[PDB]
Amino acid sequence: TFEIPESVTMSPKQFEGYTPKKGDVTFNHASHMDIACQQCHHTVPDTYTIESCMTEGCHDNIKERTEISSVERTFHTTKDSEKSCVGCHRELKRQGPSDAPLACNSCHVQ
């Protein structure tokens, strides 16, 4: 019943009439499997479900860019090293050479 999707295409195309600045992002669970599911899916105890980070009421704000609900801040902030995409990748580099990408065109596929 509960199936985990290996490859997920995260896209801003879901926002009404937003003209995206970057391409879609492909997230693979395989490369992140050693990380506790709840570290990223940090709201599991609040809803007892695992849902999209961009669900209504979560990180779905495409208007503001510096708010907690903002898409840009959420996935690129370097002040959070546990669940921010670039935040953790950035943090790994402080521990030694890391392949985890910071380049915009590594996450954002074209």
Overall size of the chain counted in residues: 110
Of ligand HEM, its own copies, none, which one sits near residue 15, judging by CB under 5 to 8 A according to partner kind? none
Instruction: Report what 52 binds from its own copies, ligand HEM, none; CB cut-off 5-8 Å by kind.
Output: ligand HEM
- Cα(57)–Cα(15) distance, rounded to whole angstroms? 13
Residue 95 contacts its own copies per CB under 8 A: no
CA pair distance 20, 18, nearest whole angstrom: 6
67 lines the binding site for its own copies (CB under 8 A): no
Number of residues that bind ligand HEM (CB under 6 A): 65
Q: Is 103 left (phi over 0), alpha (psi -120 to 50) or beta?
A: beta
The one of its own copies, ligand HEM, none whose footprint includes residue 49, by CB under 5 to 8 A per kind, is its own copies
Tell me which amino acid residue 65 is: R
Residues near its own copies (CB under 8 A) are 1-4, 6, 33, 36-39, 44-45, 48-51
